[PDB]
Each structure stands twice: as C-alpha cells, then as structure tokens.
Symmetry: C2
Subunit: 201 residues, 2 copies
C-alpha cells in the first residue's frame, strides 16, 4: 500500500542478497568444517599430537583445502596455541593468533561448546589486513568411538580470505554489481572486523 522509489527497492534487494551470499557461504563452510573435524581419523592424528605427515604429506588435511576448496588458512589449535598451520596450501610455523584480530582462546572455547550440539562456529575476522570468514569445529571422533572430553578437544579452523577475486565471483553468483572491500555505493560492516563490503546500487 506504500509506493516506493525504484532505487530504494534495488538498494534493499542488493543488501538482502549480499547478506544471503555471506550467510550461505558461512553455513556451507560450517558443514564442511564439521565434515573434516567430526572424524575419528582426524581425532587420532590431529586431536592429540599433530601428525603433519598424515595431514599434509598424505593429503588428509592438505593443500587441496586451498587449491580446490579455497581456504587460505587451515589450522589446528588447542589450549597451548596453534598446533598445525597451512597458509595457502603450504605448511607454516605462523600461529593462528598472529594472523587474526580475534581471540584464539575464544575460538577454542566456543567451538568446544558448539560441538556438544554437533555444530560449528563461524565469524568474520581480520586476516592479514583482509576480511575473512572463519569457521571452526572441535576435532572429535564419531559416535562409534568411546566418548571423549570435549573440554580438552583440539579445534580445526578454516579461514576463507575474501580476496578481490572471491568477492567478484561471490557477487556474480548473487547478481550483485562490483562486490568489493571498501577502501556513492552501498555498504555493510563485517562485524568483529574493521572491514566493510561495498557494491554498486
């Protein structure tokens, strides 16, 4: 019953589909993270001492996560810090905390709590000065295994850096013109980061 300016309708549509693009991307990475972490073999070879031979050399948690799945950062963390790091498909000694603005302990504790509900967590992070989607889930074995203490579980972390190419393809997948990191246009904040995504509308 309220007539609206056409520019206002297109601006609302663009905001709706930018938010949906981010939301669908997060939920999908959450299930992907749970697929890799709710895994008995992952629990054996990554939940205690990190077997980088099994993870990287044998490609059970290796470079394909970057060259195929596009996760610029794959990490295993526990109470002592980063136990395994793969940046751009290569093994690294760099910790998760050094590459993030968010608190690593908060990520560890939150992922352990979500695992109770068979869930992962996600959030936006500042990843080396760039916006990124972070998902994390506890490393635990499946129900056929004897129960473990989720309070001491290691946590698997997948970092999705929103590069200009990724934003260009993601916006195209949702019909949004010139989705980019804001350096007139529409914009929204990635909460928990200083970054804002912008687009034409």
């Amino acid at each position: 019953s309220i007539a609206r300016h056409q520019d206002d309708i297109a601006i609302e549509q663009s905001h709706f589909y930018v938010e949906k693009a981010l939301q669908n991307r997060r939920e999908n990475s959450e299930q992907f993270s749970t697929t890799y972490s709710f895994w008995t073999d992952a629990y054996v070879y990554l939940g205690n001492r990190v077997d980088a031979d099994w993870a990287f050399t044998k490609n059970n948690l290796g470079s394909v996560l970057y060259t195929t799945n596009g996760y610029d950062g794959v990490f295993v963390i526990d109470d002592r810090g980063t136990r395994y790091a793969m940046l751009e498909g290569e093994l690294s000694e760099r910790s998760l905390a050094d590459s993030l603005n968010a608190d690593t302990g908060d990520i560890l504790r939150s992922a352990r709590r979500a695992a109770v509900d068979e869930a992962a967590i996600s959030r936006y992070v500042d990843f080396d000065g760039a916006p990124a989607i972070l998902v994390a889930s506890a490393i635990k074995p499946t129900s056929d295994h004897a129960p473990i203490d989720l309070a001491k579980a290691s946590v698997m972390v997948f970092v999705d850096r929103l590069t200009p190419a990724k934003l260009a393809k993601l916006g195209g997948d949702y019909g949004i013109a010139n989705l980019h990191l804001l350096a007139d246009k529409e914009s929204l904040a990635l909460e928990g980061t200083p970054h804002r995504l912008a687009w034409v509308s």
Copy 2:
C-alpha cells in the same frame, strides 16, 4: 534505454535467482563429493571391495551424510553396479539404477572422465518420483599415492532429493516466494527429468 514492466523485471529476477540457487547448490555438492572421493582411505576401503564396517559402522561414509549434510542417497558404484547404498542414513540393498531414471553406466564413465581434471559431475535426476541433484566423483587416492587406473575406479554418488522442505528453505535462502515442485506461476525444467520447479512471480 528500454523501459520495462515491473512485473517483467521481477519475473526475470526470480528466474535468475532460482537458477543461481540450483547452480550454487550443485557446485558446492561437487566439491563436497570430491572431498569424500579424492581420499586415500576411501580408495582403500571403498574403491575395491566395499568395507561397510569402515563406511557405515565407523561413520567414515555414514548416516551423518543424511542427518547433517542432507544427502538422501549415498552410493558407491563400479562396472558391476551398485556396491554400497545408504538411503536416508540407513544401509540398503537397493541399487542406484533402480532409484534413478538416468543411466548408471553413463554416471560411472562420466565421473571417471571428470576425475582426470580433478573434477566431479552433476545433473538432475528423477529419484523415486522426486526431483534431485546428483553429484558423482571417482574414488581415487591423493597424489602421494602411486597412480591408479581411472578407467577401473569406483565412483561415489551423492543424491540430494529436493523435498518440499528443501525447496522451501532453498527458495528462502534466495528470496524466492513458494519454491516448489510443479504438480499462474513461473517455472523451469530440471533437464534430464520430467520435473519442473515453480514459484510465485
């Protein structure tokens, strides 16, 4: 320079986002399928004789694929037919061919060809009278393993049945009103099936 009826613009937008919803869903399931099939452990325990204890009892390819990932059908096939079937998270003796309209040999051959390019295949199928997204990828070990003959590789198949609830959630994820299986409205065909998806516009 050409002015257009507002109903025509909304109809074109709705078609764009129904097609994008299906496309993004297919591409995502293709990477998920490749994650499960390009796997040395999967090659050992599913690429030859099917170890249902490893797959289902030990939950390495088990009911979570349905109760979490929503794949109503998970199959392993080879030149002799269906070697492993899980319908709605339960082991089954029903073959993939009996539950499909598409040719099982075509799926096997096509997935073996796509594996050369490290890719999966996808298509729409008639799955027990319902529309469905099928993805398939060859079961092969990772590059650290000695090379195998892709012509004799088993193929992993994930079937995503587009139930009314799934279409309701998928359409909502893309701002489409009343996405459903067509029994005035907009419509498109799922090629390779007798099914058409319909929505309000």
